[PDB]
Structures are given as C-alpha cells and as structure tokens.
Amino acid sequence: KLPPGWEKAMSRSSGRVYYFNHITNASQWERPSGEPARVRCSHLLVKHSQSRRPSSWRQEKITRTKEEALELINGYIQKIKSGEEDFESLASQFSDCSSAKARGDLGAFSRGQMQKPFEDASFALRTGEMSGPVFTDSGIHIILRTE
Ligand SMILES: CC(=O)c1cc[nH]n1
Ligand SMILES: CC(=O)c1cc[nH]n1
Ligand SMILES: CC(=O)c1cc[nH]n1
Ligand SMILES: CC(=O)c1cc[nH]n1
Known about the structure:
147 residues; Ubiquitin Ligase Nedd4, Chain: W; Chitinase A, domain 3; four-stranded antiparallel β-sheet; binds 1-(1H-pyrazol-3-yl)ethanone; isomerase
C-alpha cells in the first residue's frame, strides 16, 4: 500500500485521516510519495541527564530531563515545519552532537554502523524527508536524509 513504515491514522482533534510512520515517527496530512546500500543524513541531537555521555560542546554538564529534551525536539520540529527555521541552521546552533559544526552532517553510511534506531529511521526516509523524534542512547534526534 504505502511505503515502508507508513500507516493511516485518525486525527483526534479534526477527525481527518493522516499518515504516520512508526519507524521514523514522521506524521503528516498528505499521503506519502512513492532500499539503497547507503544513505547520507544530517541530525540534530538533544541530550539529557541519562544520555550515554551527558556533556556536549554546548554544556559541560547536561542536566535537562528526557521529557525536557523531547519538548525541545518537538519545538524544533514545529519551527522547521512552520518555515520559521531550517533544519541545518537549528542543528548548527543547538545540536548537542559535535557534528553541529558541520550543520549536523554525519556523512554516508550503511546498515550496521549507527545506533539501530537512528539507522532504521534513516533508511526509511526518502531524500528530502525529515524524521520525528528518534530515541537512542545518545539522546533524542531529528534526522534529515540528504542523499
Ligand atoms: C536509562 C534510561 O532511563 C534512559 C532513557 C533514555 N536513555 N536512557
Ligand atoms: C522515551 C523518552 O526519552 C521520553 C521522554 C519523554 N517521553 N519519552
Ligand atoms: C531543509 C529542511 O529544513 C528540511 C526539512 C525537511 N526536509 N528538508
Ligand atoms: C554510531 C553513532 O555515532 C550514531 C548513531 C546515531 N547517531 N550517531
């Protein structure tokens, strides 16, 4: 029917169908468009107190809770989707991963190299698509597939 991971869902507030991807946590009103050995992705990471390494170039000690990190991620998604900001601009300014200095680019990778949730979300994205929140041992990510 739909591309991998995508399902129809019902909007509580509106009563209209929407589309949800349980691999990427993407959601959208529009029916999705239309696997490679490698993908290239950029990401924005928000760390929290339980991150594998709760420290970053932004903050020597990261003290926010997981719930606070998810709210930050949700806010960044809203700003990107509204057109207020672009993905890589927010990654350069606010990502807790050292890749922030390269607009969040992680380069190209195959299956079997990244943390599995990150990998699975990345390979279910099409070029130009963004994930919803992706949870790993590093923290909470949003992912942009660039190639
Ligand atoms: C160990 C734990 O609760 C957690 C939640 C996210 N990352 N780690
Ligand atoms: C799973 C996780 O990190 C989280 C934080 C808030 N809700 N869920
Ligand atoms: C460039 C950018 O912000 C974006 C978000 C989704 N796809 N691209
Ligand atoms: C393995 C690695 O560096 C990774 C996984 C998700 N993000 N970064």
